[PDB]
Write a protein that binds this ligand. Structure first.
Ligand SMILES: c1ccc(-c2c3c(nc([C@H]4CCCO4)c2-c2nnn[nH]2)CCCCC3)cc1
Length: 134
């Protein structure tokens, strides 16, 4: 067992707050905002050894990242940004920082009750998205 075990599973989006504004701050264009905002992704998290895999599956796009905590990787996001990412575990929270074009955003995934609570922050705008077990 590892602390990271509480994140493993299939998680379905059940609520979203402020995601459109967050996407505006990120620089996402109108059509992508509308279609991506409409999606109801599943977040599938698994662990094999030191490698964590996070998949997002939806009608819009399917994405998959695999990584080792603290080891930077190149990621293409669902909106087609080419970013350099690092994910660490800080006090039980998975903290994902993405850097591109002199910009940064942070995505924090936390287990709270039976939910996965995901907070995304860009330049003072936060979005909160809540996922429940599928
Ligand atoms: C369908 C819809 C949205 C996404 C997505 C996107 C972004 N950020 C996330 C953040 C939210 C919290 C977990 O990642 C998700 C996401 N939402 N759920 N899974 N992935 C970046 C902003 C532009 C739009 C793409 C992926 C597929």
């Amino acid at each position: 067992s590892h602390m990271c075990d509480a994140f493993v599973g299939t998680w379905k989006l059940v609520s979203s707050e402020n995601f459109d504004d967050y996407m505006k701050e990120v620089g996402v264009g109108f059509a992508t905002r509308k279609v991506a905002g409409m999606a109801k992704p599943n977040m599938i998290i698994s662990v094999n050894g030191d490698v964590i895999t996070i998949k997002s599956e939806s009608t819009f796009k399917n994405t998959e990242i695999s990584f080792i905590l603290g080891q930077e990787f190149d990621e293409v996001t669902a909106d087609d940004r080419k970013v350099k990412s690092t994910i660490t575990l800080d006090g039980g929270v998975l903290v994902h920082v993405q850097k591109w074009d002199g910009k940064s955003t942070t995505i924090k995934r936390k287990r709270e009750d039976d939910k996965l609570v995901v907070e995304c922050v860009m330049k003072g705008v936060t979005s909160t998205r809540v996922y429940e077990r599928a």
